[model samples]
Target: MKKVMFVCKRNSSRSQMAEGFAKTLGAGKIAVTSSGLESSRVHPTAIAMMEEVGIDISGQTSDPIENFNADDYDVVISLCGSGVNLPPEWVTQEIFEDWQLEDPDGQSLEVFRTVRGQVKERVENLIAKIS
Candidate 1:
């Protein structure tokens, strides 16, 4: 199975949501983890949005990208256009993509819902492409 890493500026919103979708949608097909350029708490709105779609992500942690080694993952995904900030090794992975999705934190519930759907669609496409 491929190992995927989802990263963003804060792991609080976009990246966290991507992790939730990947874990549930990919299941045994792929291994998933998420991190921020710097660590921060997972946004409450992110958790609530995932729950609305029947995927629970409250247990997920917001970790720093430095805590993980780029070599450990087969795919590297930047959810907030933060790919340029990641270490070179991360972007040079077997598969790398910068989705550049917007952050939903502090936004309305509808924004969160919209980004959640976008994450789900991309995650589904990624799983199909890699797994």
Candidate 2:
């Protein structure tokens, strides 16, 4: 099975959202994980937003990209438009996408809703290709 890594500047919102959707949506079809350039806490708003859609990410925590071996992943995605900030090894992975999703940290709940929907669609497409 293909393994995927979702990355962001902070593993708080966007990347966490993607990780939630990918894990739920991709399920047994693929393996998924999320991390940041550096570690931080998972955003409460992100947890709430995902919970609204029946996906619980409350148990997830922020992790640094350095915690994993990039070579183990067949796919690497940067969710905050921060692909350019990643090391060359990560960017050059077998399947790399720079999602550039919006960050809804201090933004309204509506923004989180919008991003959640967008993430679902993108993750679905990703699962399609990789599966």
Candidate 3:
């Protein structure tokens, strides 16, 4: 199975959503994980919205990207548009892409819904490509 790392600046929001979708959508097809440049807790908005979508990500924990080695993943995805700041090895992984989606921090629930839809679409596409 392809191993994917979904990363962001702070594991609080966007990256967490992507990880939630990938795990739900890519189950058995790929191995997926998510983290941030710095360690942080998963945002409540993310948890609630994911639950609304029928994907229970409330149990997922956020970790620091530093805890993981880039060499371990077959694909590295930067979801907060911070790919330019990522280390060379991370960007040079077997497959690297930056979804660069909007962050749902300090925003209304509508923003969360919109981005969730986008994340779902991308996650679905990625699974199709890799599977």
Candidate 4:
């Protein structure tokens, strides 16, 4: 199975959402994990937003990208335009894409709803592409 890594500035929101979508949407087809440039708690809003869509992400944890090896993943996705900030090895993975999605932190629930839809659509497309 392909291995996918979703990354962001903080493992708080966007990356966390992508992980949830990919795990459920790509289950059995691909393996998925997510991390951040630095670790932070998974935002409550993120969990809430995901729950609204019937996917539970409360079990996911925020982790630092440093804990993982670049060779372990076949695909690396930077969700907050942080691709340029990633180490060279990460960006050079078999499939590397910078989503550059807007950060919904501190925004209204409507913003979270919108970003959640975007994440879902992109994740579905990614699974189709890689699987």
Candidate 5:
């Protein structure tokens, strides 16, 4: 199975949303997960948005990025702009891809939806590439 992991500064919003979309939309062809440099909680707005889309991602929890192995992933995606501690070269050659997106810590609902749309589009493109 191909593994694709999405990462961010908190793993609270963007990354988790990306993972949820990839897992559900990919139709099981790709295994997806998300993590953060600092583990905390998944954003409530994120959970609510996902539920609005009929995806039950409320069960997802935040986790530290160090808990995951960069080598284990066929594709490692960084969704947030905090890769200072994580060395790209240390990960695998050509496997780590960074999106360097903004942190939507307290973004409004419209902004969250916009980001979600972007994630969904990216997931579609990524799944096609993985195929």
Candidate 6:
């Protein structure tokens, strides 16, 4: 199975949303997860916004990158733009991309929803390209 990891500064909103979208969209074809440079609580607004899209990540816990090994993943996408530096092993020449979605932490539901939609769109396109 192809493995994908979405990353951000907090692993609270953008990366979580990206993982939720990718997991739901490419369920059988891929295994997806997310993490951050610094750990954080999952945003409630993010949970509700994704619920609107039919994925509930209410029980999912946010984790730090140190908990995951880079070599195991097939692809890594930075959802936080240039917020964090990746480990040397994950910095392969190809099979990496950045989507640069907005951070919806402690923001309005509308903002979180907008970020959710943007992540879904990006994930869809990325999946197609990889497939």
- Candidate 3 TM-score, C-alpha based: 0.86
Candidate 3 Cα outliers beyond 4 Å, as residue runs: 12-16
- Top model by TM-score, which number? 2
Kindly report which residue stretches of model 2 are placed more than 4 angstroms away from their true locations once superposed.
Answer: 12-16
Q: What TM-score fits each model?
A: 0.88, 0.88, 0.86, 0.87, 0.81, 0.84
Winner on lDDT between 2 and 6 is: 2
lDDT of 2 by residue, 1-131 (tens): 88988877666444348888888886789988776676576776677778787886775665577776888999998887757656778888899888868877778888888888888899999998988
Candidates' C-alpha lDDT? 0.78, 0.78, 0.76, 0.77, 0.68, 0.72
Q: Give RMSD (Å) of candidate 4 vs. truth.
A: 1.9
Tell me the number of clashing residue pairs for each predicted model: 0, 0, 0, 0, 0, 0
lDDT of 3 by residue, 1-131 (tens): 87898877666444248888898887788888766566577776677778877886664655676677888998888887757645678888887887868877877788888888888898888888877
lDDT per residue as tens, model 5, 1-131? 58877766555445247778888897569787766566566776777777767776765665666776676678877676545556563246345666655544577767767777888888788888778
**Model 1 root-mean-square deviation:** 1.8
- In model 5, pairs of residues that clash are none
lDDT of 6 by residue, 7-117 (tens): 765654442588788988997988887666666666666677787889957756557776788878878887766535667666562567866667777667778778877
> Candidate 1, residues 1-131: lDDT per residue as tens digits?
97888877555444248888898887789988877676566776676677888887775664677788998999998877758766788988988888878878767788877887788888899999996
Model 1's TM-score against the true structure: 0.88
Pairs clashing within candidate 2: none
Off by over 4 Å in 1: 12-16
